[PDB]
Design an enzyme around this catalytic site. Structure first.
Site, mmCIF file in Angstrom:
data_model
loop_
_atom_site.group_PDB
_atom_site.id
_atom_site.type_symbol
_atom_site.label_atom_id
_atom_site.label_comp_id
_atom_site.label_asym_id
_atom_site.label_seq_id
_atom_site.Cartn_x
_atom_site.Cartn_y
_atom_site.Cartn_z
ATOM 1 N N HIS B 41 29.279 28.092 41.604
ATOM 2 C CA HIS B 41 30.417 27.365 41.035
ATOM 3 C C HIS B 41 31.369 26.722 42.148
ATOM 4 O O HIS B 41 32.427 26.182 41.804
ATOM 5 C CB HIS B 41 31.206 28.268 40.079
ATOM 6 C CG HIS B 41 31.939 29.392 40.749
ATOM 7 N ND1 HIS B 41 33.049 29.191 41.545
ATOM 8 C CD2 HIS B 41 31.749 30.731 40.708
ATOM 9 C CE1 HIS B 41 33.499 30.355 41.977
ATOM 10 N NE2 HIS B 41 32.717 31.302 41.496
ATOM 11 N N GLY B 143 39.743 33.136 45.071
ATOM 12 C CA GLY B 143 39.184 32.847 46.386
ATOM 13 C C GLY B 143 38.453 33.993 47.100
ATOM 14 O O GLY B 143 38.014 33.833 48.260
ATOM 15 N N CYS B 145 35.632 35.014 45.756
ATOM 16 C CA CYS B 145 34.228 34.866 45.368
ATOM 17 C C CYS B 145 33.331 34.679 46.586
ATOM 18 O O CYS B 145 33.731 34.091 47.595
ATOM 19 C CB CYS B 145 34.023 33.700 44.400
ATOM 20 S SG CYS B 145 34.914 33.925 42.867
HETATM 21 C C1 LIG Z 1 36.404 32.895 42.776
HETATM 22 O O1 LIG Z 1 37.227 32.829 43.937
HETATM 23 C C2 LIG Z 1 37.211 33.419 41.587
HETATM 24 C C3 LIG Z 1 37.549 34.914 41.783
HETATM 25 C C4 LIG Z 1 38.283 35.433 40.559
HETATM 26 C C5 LIG Z 1 39.639 34.742 40.482
HETATM 27 C C6 LIG Z 1 40.658 35.860 40.265
HETATM 28 N N1 LIG Z 1 39.939 37.087 40.457
HETATM 29 C C7 LIG Z 1 38.636 36.885 40.632
HETATM 30 O O2 LIG Z 1 37.827 37.764 40.801
HETATM 31 N N2 LIG Z 1 36.352 33.241 40.417
HETATM 32 C C8 LIG Z 1 36.736 32.546 39.351
HETATM 33 O O3 LIG Z 1 37.836 32.015 39.290
HETATM 34 C C9 LIG Z 1 35.790 32.423 38.183
HETATM 35 C C10 LIG Z 1 35.139 31.030 38.213
HETATM 36 C C11 LIG Z 1 35.750 30.250 37.052
HETATM 37 C C12 LIG Z 1 36.574 31.208 36.212
HETATM 38 N N3 LIG Z 1 36.598 32.463 36.966
HETATM 39 C C13 LIG Z 1 37.282 33.556 36.611
HETATM 40 O O4 LIG Z 1 37.258 34.607 37.223
HETATM 41 O O5 LIG Z 1 38.091 33.459 35.409
HETATM 42 C C14 LIG Z 1 38.960 34.545 35.050
HETATM 43 C C15 LIG Z 1 39.300 34.220 33.644
HETATM 44 C C16 LIG Z 1 38.250 33.907 32.783
HETATM 45 C C17 LIG Z 1 38.491 33.574 31.456
HETATM 46 C C18 LIG Z 1 39.797 33.537 30.978
HETATM 47 C C19 LIG Z 1 40.858 33.836 31.831
HETATM 48 C C20 LIG Z 1 40.607 34.172 33.165
HETATM 49 C C21 LIG Z 1 40.178 34.626 35.902
HETATM 50 C C22 LIG Z 1 40.966 35.779 35.889
HETATM 51 C C23 LIG Z 1 42.110 35.864 36.675
HETATM 52 C C24 LIG Z 1 42.467 34.795 37.500
HETATM 53 C C25 LIG Z 1 41.682 33.641 37.523
HETATM 54 C C26 LIG Z 1 40.533 33.567 36.734
HETATM 55 C C27 LIG Z 1 34.259 30.586 37.030
HETATM 56 C C28 LIG Z 1 33.255 29.518 37.482
HETATM 57 C C29 LIG Z 1 33.685 31.700 36.140
#
Ligand SMILES: *[C@H](O)[C@H](C[C@@H]1CCNC1=O)NC(=O)[C@@H]1[C@@H]2[C@H](CN1C(=O)OC(c1ccccc1)c1ccccc1)C2(C)C
Ligand SMILES: *[C@H](O)[C@H](C[C@@H]1CCNC1=O)NC(=O)[C@@H]1[C@@H]2[C@H](CN1C(=O)OC(c1ccccc1)c1ccccc1)C2(C)C
Lengths: 306, 306
Positions: B41, B143, B145
């Site tokens: 992603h 960030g 990931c």
């Molecule tokens: C990659 O850096 C990031 C790590 C996440 C962000 C916060 N904590 C983590 O472990 N990964 C993502 O942002 C992934 C990417 C986008 C959405 N996502 C994600 O984790 O989404 C959740 C979320 C999902 C559905 C509804 C609400 C939140 C999220 C949770 C907290 C903060 C940000 C995002 C994909 C491609 C799956």
């Protein structure tokens, strides 16, 4: 999100760990520039460890008595001296992996990472707090002595701890890197006890803020208390007094969450009086006191190091 | 003595962490030989992450779209391909710090160490269990990931996990290093939920043995139960069934302590029915299930790695 007891990356320390052997004793040493640092009870035998006189023991040693293994490479000792409870073995090779470093001494209530080692080989890493009574609740088996504790600040490693012994209660004791013991302990196998401990009050409040940031809110409440009247309850749950400097260092966390420091104290007063009634906080069923305000901020913001 | 949740030394992994930037997205990647592995992603925008079609998205990318920072040195991408949910960026430089490694997939109930990273810079290290529902209770901010999970076996690093996302409950989800998700999750920002979890029964018994070795004995008892009749209580405390292979892997711990596996189960049956009545076990007020039998043995004997 998530909260989780987190050590510093250990790479920079792993490159300094070596094996020191003298007679029958083998322990770990710390190789920075052209010196290897290690606990002085390596010169002892087992019948020497009951009541040694180390500075007579050391005049009887030679450079070649000290066998230094950096992995699968032997270092020759070219000098040896004692500084307090640590030994300083001057070797013919400067450690090419020597990080930028400092020797610091930490305050009870402060945390650090421990790289547990055996035979000069790193085994594992974990976080520790220096208890109010100058012990640490580590995980240390025979031959872990000379494992160090540390923090990292960008690129600079601040060494604060060298392991020496375990006390009868199963807690651990050691020195700073200039050889001075943390707390009222000596490197003699005798009847030492830890001294009475207390709970680090400022850290508990820190962790409660970590909880609120991560969504655990059930312990919150509209109530408030005075700094004075919270400290009355602190004294009777064997908690440390809270000071206006602790309230200051909690300021940034208070701001992020919108929960005044004195309101969280009132939330803690209740936790102490009522317990938790089958509930948990950050997956713990206890009030946790080994996270500093900087630890919470670090992890609930996510700093890094090189 | 001492018991303490312990990660592997992170050095060998730290030497592989890099920063991958594509457009506005920046995340971590894993540099082994002349390849950098990272979650796919990264090619997405934010309006691309709601319902991407990654293999159309990738034919529109160029080698020079991918900006790879190994510390303060840029690597040129000379090839890119997608394997399942990870990207494979072929670079012009083989990582000189490439450890001996393997790509393994772990089983729920098994543990690993996570090296949390931001911008290619290691931030911290900690231990995690793969829950029965294929999530992990980590500590991950935007960030992070591309941070990996791993175990170490002498000199060989077995990578088992790459972080991709956080679920609405605050748990974390990811893949193995061949790109296949752990559990029923997709790398789309939609409404996924974790699935119902259970307590890892064999690990709890492991930890109880860790406790007995460290002197916590109050929960012991003369009683015994049959494997059958313990599993009846397991089912009603949302614990997993215990099998005769679990009893086998607990054999070495049973032997060291002299406490038969079925007697410890009887001790656990009581803990579940009665709770702990104000007491603790290894400084926890909860039955802990994230230590494997090998973890206990490792730490209550103290293996090492090079
Ligand atoms: C990659 O850096 C990031 C790590 C996440 C962000 C916060 N904590 C983590 O472990 N990964 C993502 O942002 C992934 C990417 C986008 C959405 N996502 C994600 O984790 O989404 C959740 C979320 C999902 C559905 C509804 C609400 C939140 C999220 C949770 C907290 C903060 C940000 C995002 C994909 C491609 C799956
Ligand atoms: C150095 O490798 C070793 C590490 C200790 C051993 C077990 N866990 C550890 O942290 N340090 C020592 O053995 C020090 C050395 C000798 C005695 N000692 C020590 O820790 O003694 C305790 C002990 C002390 C008094 C009474 C009973 C036990 C101990 C505890 C468990 C196992 C062994 C030793 C000095 C020079 C202090």
């Amino acid at each position: 999100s998530g909260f989780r007891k987190m050590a510093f990356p250990s790479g920079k320390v792993e490159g300094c760990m070596v094996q020191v052997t003298c007679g029958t004793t083998t322990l770990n040493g710390l190789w920075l520039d052209d010196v290897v640092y290690c606990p002085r009870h390596v010169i002892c035998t087992s019948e020497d460890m009951l009541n040694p006189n180390y500075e007579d023991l050391l005049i009887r040693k030679s450079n070649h008595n000290f066998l230094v293994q950096a992995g699968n490479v032997q270092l020759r000792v070219i000098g040896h001296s004692m500084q307090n409870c640590v030994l300083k073995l001057k070797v013919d090779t400067a450690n090419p992996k020597t990080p930028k470093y400092k020797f610091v001494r930490i305050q009870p209530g402060q945390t650090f990472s421990v790289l547990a080692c055996y035979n000069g080989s790193p085994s594992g890493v974990y976080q520790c707090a220096m208890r109010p009574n100058f012990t640490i609740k580590g995980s240390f088996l025979n031959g872990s002595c000379g494992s160090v504790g540390f923090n990292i600040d960008y690129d600079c490693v601040s060494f604060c701890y060298m392991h020496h012994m375990e006390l009868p209660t199963g807690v651990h004791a050691g020195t700073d890197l200039e050889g001075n013991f943390y707390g009222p302990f000596v490197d003699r196998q005798t009847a030492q006890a830890a001294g009475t401990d207390t709970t680090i009050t400022v850290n508990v409040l820190a962790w409660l803020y970590a909880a609120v940031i991560n969504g655990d809110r059930w312990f919150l409440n509209r109530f408030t208390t005075t700094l004075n009247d919270f400290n009355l309850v602190a004294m009777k749950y064997n908690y440390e007094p809270l000071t206006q400097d602790h309230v200051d260092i909690l300021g940034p966390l208070s701001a992020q969450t919108g929960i005044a420091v004195l309101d969280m104290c009132a939330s803690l007063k209740e936790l102490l009086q009522n317990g938790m009634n089958g509930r948990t906080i950050l997956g713990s069923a206890l009030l946790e006191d080994e996270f500093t305000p900087f630890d919470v901020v670090r992890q609930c913001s996510g700093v890094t190091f090189q």
